[PDB]
């Protein structure tokens, strides 16, 4: 080994609410590249996330028709709602209700809010209505997951269930969607020159960078535990 000098975490930078940069203590040669690649792949591959699975609406029955008083179609509504980012507490499989009437724009702020649900972007567009008498009434089913799941995968889960009026969606469970790492040598003079690695990520704001990297470290430890024997 000869004084490996395992690094530590330092200089947690919050570039933005969804984008940030994290740096690590310097390490030995030929390790920043592999460490960065492995960590990036771990984060981009299997990281828990929360998304919508199904939405029920009293007004319309199937996604291929419309509702009187709106400008956009149900499919566009689905596309917008799968673009939603939201974080939940330990309890999973939470359903919320959205109700509004009028002509004004509709966003994430004017929704039934609970103590375990936290909206990161109350600015998202939910296909604002066009008629004053128009009123919306739907419930949104939200769970947590780790990898992308299409609705075809979840077909088996309900045969007697799923009456007409409830429409499934596809879950991605990807909170980050982009990351990058850079390695460089500095901050060492008393010893030999050593490389330091910096990770830059942009997220949806649903997860925190320190927690995500801690989970990546724990899971990589979990794998590497098995190969010792």
């Amino acid at each position: 080994v000869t004084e490996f000098l395992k690094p530590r975490l330092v200089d947690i930078e919050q570039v933005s609410s969804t984008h940030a940069k994290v740096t690590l203590e310097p390490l030995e040669r030929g390790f920043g590249h592999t460490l960065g690649n492995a960590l990036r792949r771990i984060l981009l591959s299997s990281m828990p996330g929360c998304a919508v699975t199904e939405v029920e609406i009293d007004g319309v029955l199937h996604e291929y028709s419309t509702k009187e008083g709106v400008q956009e179609d149900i499919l566009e509504i689905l596309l917008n709602l799968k673009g939603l980012a939201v974080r939940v507490q330990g309890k999973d499989e939470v359903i919320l209700t959205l109700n509004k009437s009028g002509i004004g724009p509709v966003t994430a702020a004017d929704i039934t809010h609970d103590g375990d649900v936290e909206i990161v972007k109350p600015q998202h567009v939910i296909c604002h209505l066009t008629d004053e008498n128009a009123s919306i009434s739907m419930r949104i089913k939200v769970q947590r997951g780790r990898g992308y799941v299409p609705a075809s995968t979840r077909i088996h889960s309900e045969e007697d269930e799923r009456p007409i009026g409830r429409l499934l969606v596809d879950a991605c469970y990807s909170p980050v969607e982009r990351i990058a790492y850079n390695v460089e040598a500095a901050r060492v003079e008393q010893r030999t020159d050593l490389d330091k690695l910096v990770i830059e990520m942009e997220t949806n704001g649903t997860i925190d960078p320190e927690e995500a990297i801690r989970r990546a470290a724990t899971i990589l430890a979990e794998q590497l535990e098995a190969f010792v024997d």
């Binding site: 291929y64 028709s65 419309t66 509702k67 009187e68 008083g69 709106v70 400008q71 956009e72 179609d73 066009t130 008629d131």
Partner: protein
């Protein structure tokens, strides 16, 4: 919408007759996901008529190739629209340009 173009895509889209264009209209009053009504100004208006132009979109219709055709609205509300201006966007179209 394609980023690299040849210009003729706009003419192709408008002359295809697959989307909705504005004929002798002055301003939009109400917009629906499938219904479009535009109030023509008195300039292009002749007496003996109410002075409103209604347009109903094509929503999820099977084609000869068993495909789906749907016309999407373009304007938002209360927008002064001139004659010959596109109003809706059909399949493989975007803002009056053939976007396939």
């Amino acid at each position: 919408k394609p980023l690299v173009g040849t210009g003729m895509e706009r003419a192709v889209a408008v002359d295809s007759g697959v989307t909705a264009v504005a004929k002798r209209g002055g301003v939009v009053q109400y917009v629906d996901a499938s219904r479009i009504v535009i109030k023509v100004n008195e300039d292009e208006m002749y007496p003996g008529e109410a002075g409103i132009d209604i347009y109903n979109l094509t929503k999820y219709t099977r084609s000869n190739q068993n495909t789906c055709i749907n016309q999407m609205p373009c304007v938002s509300l209360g927008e002064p629209v001139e004659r010959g201006d596109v109003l809706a966007d059909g399949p493989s179209t975007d803002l009056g340009e053939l976007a396939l």
